[PDB]
Ligand binder design. Structure first.
Ligand code: SCM
Length: 250
């Protein structure tokens, strides 16, 4: 069917074909460029455009990227494709939270079938994305590197972007237990040392640095992201999520 080289290229060509010269650059970030592209990692694309997309231009992007990506239940070699589109002019003057023009994500697929087209939205998670992408990124198209397309984002805004998304996360940990546990730990480290680390090894770092009760649940979420079917319905994630939330507060 498709391997990851084909995935990189069809996504690369879908964007130059259906956005023409509105496309300034397309970049890859996340744990695929950071700490190596393991066969388990996800494909996080970042796309910079000049002018806004009209809803149907955002709709063909959904429909053509749709078969290219891995569905949540897919027990195959395909990996998730997460692409966010930002507009360069909507980025200066810098201001948290930043503006976002488009987003593809497979957690939004149930909404995609019902007719949802991601429209202009303010996302605070985007602040840490651009911060870690300005640092380490792989450019697959464009005449400029990502760092000359975004202003210097201050570390004062990531620290609040960390915590703004923190207490957004404490409310809706439900049904995303495995991922939200490891994300908070990555945020504990990103705001203590300043390094953004894969959630795989971010969990084990705080694991042995935390009480046993939460230690067990941190390591249980280490496995479930590596496959390893784990049913959280009787584990008390509320306690560990409450613990990591307060440990981050500083
Ligand atoms: C940070 N943005 C998203 C967002 O938090 C999603 N929440 C529904 C989150 O969802 C996941 O945990 C999923 O279960 C689905 C997967 C494609 O993305 C994973 O990472 C997804 C994150 O990348």
């Amino acid at each position: 069917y498709l391997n990851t080289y084909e995935q990189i290229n069809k996504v690369k060509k879908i964007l130059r074909k259906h956005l023409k010269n509105n496309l300034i650059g397309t970049y890859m970030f996340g744990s695929g460029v950071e700490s190596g592209l393991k066969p388990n990692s996800d494909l996080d694309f970042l796309v910079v455009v000049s002018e806004p997309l009209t809803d149907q231009s955002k709709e063909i992007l959904i429909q053509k990227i749709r078969p290219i990506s891995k569905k949540i239940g897919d027990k195959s070699n395909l990996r998730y494709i997460e692409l966010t589109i930002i507009i360069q002019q909507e980025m200066v003057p810098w201001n948290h939270p930043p503006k976002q023009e488009f987003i593809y994500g497979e957690w939004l697929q149930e909404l995609y079938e019902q007719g949802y087209i991601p429209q202009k939205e303010l996302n605070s998670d985007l602040t840490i994305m651009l911060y870690q992408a300005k640092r380490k990124n792989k450019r697959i198209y464009g005449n400029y590197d990502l760092e000359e397309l975004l202003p210097d984002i201050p570390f004062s805004d990531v620290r609040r972007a960390i915590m703004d998304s923190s207490e957004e996360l404490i409310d809706n940990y439900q049904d995303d237990e495995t991922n939200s546990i490891l994300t908070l730990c990555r945020m504990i480290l990103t705001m203590d040392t300043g390094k953004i680390i894969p959630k795989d090894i971010a969990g084990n770092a705080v694991a042995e640095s935390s009480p046993l009760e939460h230690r067990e649940r941190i390591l249980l979420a280490v496995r479930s992201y590596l496959g390893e079917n784990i049913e959280w319905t009787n584990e008390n994630v509320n306690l560990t999520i409450n613990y990591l939330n307060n440990r981050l507060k500083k």
